[PDB]
Design a protein around this ligand. Sequence first.
Ligand SMILES: [Mg+2]
Lengths: 118, 117
Amino acid sequence: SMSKNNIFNKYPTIIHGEARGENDEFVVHTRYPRFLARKSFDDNFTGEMPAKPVNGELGQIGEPRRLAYDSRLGLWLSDFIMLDNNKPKNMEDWLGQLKAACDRIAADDLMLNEDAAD
Amino acid sequence: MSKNNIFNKYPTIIHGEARGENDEFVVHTRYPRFLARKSFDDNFTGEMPAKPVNGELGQIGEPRRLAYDSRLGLWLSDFIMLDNNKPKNMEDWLGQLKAACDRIAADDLMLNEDAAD
Ligand SMILES: [Mg+2]
């Protein structure tokens, strides 16, 4: 929806979520491609800002195979729900845009602890 | 329908924050599903209310937009409904939205308590 999308654009691009009773966290991406995702951490996760820029990978996990994002730094993005109803005209470009957004989300998450420290 | 079920995989109430904003956010993953902005009055205390949260829905600003006033300093605004269907009955839709907003406001009040305990 163009109307709905215009309302989405009045939101910050990356929203970090939490829920009572949950150790997993959450995310909302309000710019195209829009989605809601579960943000989870590996046991070894540090939360530290990395020297290199975030370069994750999109892939399939589990049985049945489901789309997941591996930040390669302990952060995972899962259970994606797309908030745009249009189907992407080109899939390869959609995967690239989704992966780039996930990399942005992971780096933004790493900024959370630093901000709290300062 | 199929997107609604993946919504069923999530907790009912999700509390959000964004870098650079003082306003907070909420995602309601049960019907009626939406994303909203959670804002606070200057004098908001966050101390648990003696009586149950009983907010009201109404219209604010010019042009008039739907907003929820918890009556305890918490506001929900800029509602983006995540269900595509239009409700058959509007006043029952408003009642369900209001009930979800009261639950969201009480859950937000519980956040501080949780951090203390
Ligand atoms: Mg497995």
